[PDB]
Structure 1
Amino acid sequence: NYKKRLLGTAFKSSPFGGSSHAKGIVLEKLGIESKQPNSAIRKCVRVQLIKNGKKVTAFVPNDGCLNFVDENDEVLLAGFGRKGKAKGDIPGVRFKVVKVSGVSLLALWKEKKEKPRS
């Protein structure tokens, strides 16, 4: 080109359609470990989104029981949070699964006393 073109800004979440939410199907209910010093088993899930048709990894909030996510449960991805990513904890997870909504297969953690239920 006349001048080299630099890479521009990229959107944080490509839920495609710039949509607020996208629904996908769980491929696998994996568990990833944190980075930096923190350690634990963060519960995550690969999801096949309809919109992008993209496959993504999403965080599953709440202590949950075991959690209510299985091999092929329908789920909604919020991108909850600005990015919806958990950078400090787990790289590669762009979105959060909304179970607060309790929409789809993701059930809400029951009887959660604390306010984060919201």
Structure 2
Amino acid sequence: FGGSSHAKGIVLEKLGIESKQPNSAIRKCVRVQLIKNGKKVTAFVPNDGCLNFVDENDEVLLAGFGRKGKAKGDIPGVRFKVVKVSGVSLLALWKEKKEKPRS
């Protein structure tokens, strides 16, 4: 960020992670280019699934990790997460409190 708390960007590609508990499953990262800057930064998706949900080429919102940078656990080098794809606030789609738009 430019010192800010949030920023809006566009997904260009979707990467792959993996886990150890309770089994090995993909834990998902992406590459998101900043709209205001053009910088493409890695971002993590904290949830189960939601690789199904987000997309390529969608305009997303970004937030921090609450550790002043500083990648959380065994995720090497990601400093940001997505809270709102298309401004739809991921947790609403997480239960079924919202339905994804046309794109």
Same-fold call, TM cutoff 0.5:
yes
Taking the aligned partners of 1:113 and 1:72, their CA distance within structure 2 comes to 20
User: Hey, which of these two has a bigger chunk of strand by percent?
Assistant: 2
Per-residue deviation, 1:40: 3.6
TM-score, length basis structure 1: 0.61
Instruction: Render the CA deviation track for 1:1-56: whole Å, top value 9, x for unaligned.
Output: xxxxxxxxxxxxxxx33111011100111112359999541111100012332110
Equivalent position SS for 1:107: helix
Q: Which stretch of the first structure deviates more once superposed, 21-30 or 106-115?
A: 106-115
Q: How many residues align?
A: 103
Contact 1:73 1:106 in 2 (8 A): no
Of 36-45 and 55-64, more deviation after overlay is shown by 36-45
Hey, what's the Cα distance between the residues in 1 that align with 2:71 and 2:12? 20
Distance 1:64 1:36, change over 3 A: closer
The answer to whether the 8 Å contact 2:13/2:31 transfers is yes
Q: Pick from 14, 23, 33: which aligns with 2:18?
A: 33
Bigger shift: residues 50-59 or 63-72: 63-72
- Does the residue aligned with 1:24 lie in a helix, a strand or coil? strand
Deviation of 1:66 after TM superposition, in Å, equals 4.4
| CA gap 1:100/1:23 in 2 versus in 1, 3 angstroms | closer
Distance 1:83 1:112, change over 3 A: farther
* TM-score, normalised via structure 2 length: 0.68
Matched, 1:95 2:80: yes
CA RMSD across the alignment: 5.7
Greater Rg over alpha carbons, structure? 1
